[PDB]
Every structure is written in C-alpha cells, then in structure tokens.
C-alpha cells in the first residue's frame, strides 16, 4: 500500500522495429500493444520494450492535507 516510485532499473531494451511489428490495430482506430508482467522473472515486456529489475521505494506522502 502507498505510492512507490522507481529508484533503480537494471536493464531496459528498446527495439522500434519489433515495436512497430507487435502493435495491432483494434476494432476502433486506436492501436494497442499487449503487456505481460512476470514477477517471478522480474521482467515487464510490452511491444518493443522490455524492462528488467525495476526497483521502487515508498515515497512519504506530501501530507499537504489540503482538505481540512
């Protein structure tokens, strides 16, 4: 619980050609790319992007409490 922000990433690969290949147009005009998250292998893969070793650390809330 609470918001976690990225602090480290071990490796990011980008391949625009594979990215264009993987995109598939939906029944609407909008395009889409399927994304799979494997926590066991610590890999997020979507289109031509592949993130591994993402580390997130809890950032304390600003406690602005603008609502009183």
């Amino acid at each position: 619980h609470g918001l976690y922000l990225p602090t480290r990433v071990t490796a990011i690969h980008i391949d625009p050609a594979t990215h264009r290949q993987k995109l598939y147009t939906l029944q609407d005009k909008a395009q889409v790319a399927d994304v799979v998250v494997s926590r066991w292998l610590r890999v997020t893969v979507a289109g031509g992007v592949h993130i591994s070793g993402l580390h997130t650390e809890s950032a304390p809330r600003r406690q602005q409490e603008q609502q009183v």
């Binding site: 609470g2 809890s58 304390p60 609502q67 009183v68």
Partner: protein, 518 residues
Amino acid sequence: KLSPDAIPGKWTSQDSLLGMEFSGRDASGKRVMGLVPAKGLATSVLLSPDFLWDVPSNWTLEEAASVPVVYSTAYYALVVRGRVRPGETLLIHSGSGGVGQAAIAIALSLGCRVFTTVGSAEKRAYLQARFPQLDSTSFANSRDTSFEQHVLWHTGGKGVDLVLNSLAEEKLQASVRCLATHGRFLEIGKFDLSQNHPLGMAIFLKNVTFHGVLLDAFFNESSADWREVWALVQAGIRDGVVRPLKCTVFHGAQVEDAFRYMAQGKHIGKVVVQVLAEEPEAVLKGAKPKLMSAISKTFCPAHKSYIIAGGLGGFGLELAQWLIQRGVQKLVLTSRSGIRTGYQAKQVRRWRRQGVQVQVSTSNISSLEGARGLIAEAAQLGPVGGVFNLAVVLRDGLLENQTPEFFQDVCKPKYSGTLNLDRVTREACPELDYFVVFSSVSCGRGNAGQSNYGFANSAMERICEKRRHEGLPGLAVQWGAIGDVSGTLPQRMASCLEVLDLFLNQPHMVLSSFVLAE
C-alpha cells in the same frame, strides 16, 4: 527518515511499528524479557514463547530491557555468521552503542584482541571503565577514517579478522581495507545496502566473506535457525557473559522526552521507557496492568460478524477494507446483482486469500423477511457485531418531474431498510455494538432536485436518534462528496475514513463532515 513499510512482514496502516524489545511479567506471573518484530512500545505485547527468555533473580526488570536486541544481534553476527574463534582480532565500530558493547563482551570472553571506535573522549573513558582488558591502544575515532591507520599500524599491516561494521559511505570503504586474509566482514548498517553503493570485488582475492547481517529476518521467518541464537543468549546469561547495559529510564507519560534524548545522540547505553514499576514479589500473578488513558480508536473482535449493506458499492468496498484492517475476519456484503465488475471480484478474492470469511448475499433489506435472512446468515458466520446501511437508489429531478413511484424507489433501501434492520436487531442481535447509516449533506443543508433523497436520508436519522435514546447504538454520518470512489469540494477517501474513525467513538447521534470550496 525511514519508511514504515521497510520493516519485514505485512504490517497494516503503518501503525504501532515502534518498539522491538520489552521486559515484564508473563501471563502466569513470571518475569520475562522478549524480542518482538514491532509494537514493543505498549502496555501489552502478544508474542510467541520462543522469543521469551527468563530474567535471573539477580537482575532487575529495568536491566533486562537492554539485553535482548543487542545481545541477540551480537551473537548472531559474531558466533553464527562470523564463526569467531579464540585469539582472533576484531574491529568493532561504535563501541559505546549497545551492539558494540555486546560484541566487546562476547569477544573479551573468548580472549580476542578488540579494536573499537568511539566518537568522543567521555565514551572512551566509559568503555575503559567497563572493560579493563581494553588497553589505551584499542581505541580509535569513529568520526573520521583515522581508525584505518590505527588498525593497520598496530596489527603490523596484517589487518583484522572480523569487522562488525555499522558506519556508512567512506567509512565503510575504510573498514574493508582493514580486513586480513580469511577475514570476515559483518555488515549490519543498512544505508549503503539500501543505496546499492558499489563494492570493488578485488578484496575477494584475499580469502574473505562479506556477510550481510539482518536480524529482522528471524522475527518473521527462519524460525528453525532462531533456536541457535536463543540457546547462545541463554548460555551467555547463565555463564555470566551477558551483562546488562546502563539504562536511562523515562516514565510512560514522558515518552517524547525519551525520543528527543535519543535523537540528540548524547546517550551512552540504552534508553528505556518505564510503562509500569516493578514489584518486590517474584511472581505477582497480577490480573491486569494499571489502567491508563489513551486516544480511542476503533477495533473489532475476531469472532463477531458484520453486515455492510450495499457493500459492493464504491464506498462499501473501501469501508470493508477499512474494517478488515481493524480486525474483522468475517464479513457479509449485500447487493441485488452481486459481483458484476472486476474491481469487486479483485477485492473479494484478496480478502478471501487474506483469511477473511467474506460472503456476498442477495438478501434485500427492504423486506422484513429479507432482513431476517440476512441477520441469520450473519449469525451462521457468527454473532452479529455491527450493521452498516450504505444502500442507495437515486432518482433526481425537480418536484414537478417527481412522482410517487420514484419516491418509493429512493426511500425503500434507506428508509424501509433501516426500519427492518432496527426491528431485526432489537429482536435477535444481543452482541451488536455498531449500527451506522450514511446520510448526505443534502439532508441537512439541502440541494435542489434531490427532494426524495433528502426525505430518505432525514428518515434514517430519526431511527438512529431513537435507538440511542433507548440505550441501543446508532449513528448517522452526513457526508458531503466522496472523491476517489452544495458548494462542497469532494472529500478524499483517506480523510473520510479518518473522520469515520473519529465519529464512531463520539457520544452524539448525528454527525456531518464536508470540505468547503475555496
């Protein structure tokens, strides 16, 4: 400076993580000292007997509070991980601190030559007093890297065999250079590790083991390996190696002063908080601790059952989640259609996995038979503890457009439902302690086009007011606008839940909460 979620184990709401050790009477009246992963600052601690030692008759309960954490971590770091043997040489940073003192006590028992780092000269005098075996050449400065030259010169350039390190950044690198062949490094500080600071691997050409010592793992896992450390501490206590640290006692009402004294960093030894005094009797077999005043916050028994009408609604799911975090382990949620969206299914599955005995009912509280069936289901899960009526059906439009059917539809789940709930609860709910119905500021302040909604909401308040006057519980909360799920800005969910926590513990009948625009 430290996020509460960093502590291992899924603690909820980040509440009461303070405290790790205590010393007090057991349920049977035996003096005991313990070690809890969290929630040690309290007038009562729930613990497994594996994490409880015995306080020998020579000791006073005050002294016992200093032993557990520091001596357990020292033993685990040296004996279990560093496999210390007699005659070795150790560099123990921050001797004045508790862990440093315990490490010195363990090392001097085996006969090792001990190098220690102390920030000032008063701490040097103290350590020289406590441990006469230390010579004048065994003290370095912990506020600069000068200790490296000291260790290197006085060891003939060979180095040290063990290093119980707690310093950070440039100090850590300087510590490694003191290692000798086959030397072991015991990292207990958690700054560089959290920051992923690099460590050159060239030190490993010298046969070297770089241990990471984290005792927080035992409190939550690795139970089998704990008995080793427990046995070591018990053996030390019976043999006399374990000697309590000097304690600066602070009374219960002055805990902020204790925290400030610790923060200033001038303390030597351990700071302890005296929740209660020690009695001369060896086994008092006392009934209860002396009562004290504390801010009142809501909690629920594990064996009772709660009913959230309209629990699959936007606010109902958040209210249930709040209830689960406060100790509810059997819940009944009502909805005409049932689970029909992904978010609801996700929440119910997570709650069921957590062990909560969630149950979705189609019983309609509009009809008396349906209300009786709902309460019977709650009884099947267990005694009814609380009833929350969050059902709503909206039909907006000015009076010229309104019609009797729309009024009936809007009033049924809120007006009739509350009447039937009150009847069935007065009939067959003796253990009930909460009965909350959620209203809207439209009832009090008024808002055009919501005449029927206001009528329904105002009608719920009367039932609650009658219930309280006759001795039974009741509370209507007039909310404004709920944001995450007039002239009033929408109110966030966390603020709403905090306010609800306040409201439940007030003695009044109808309460309101809203956020003014600009």
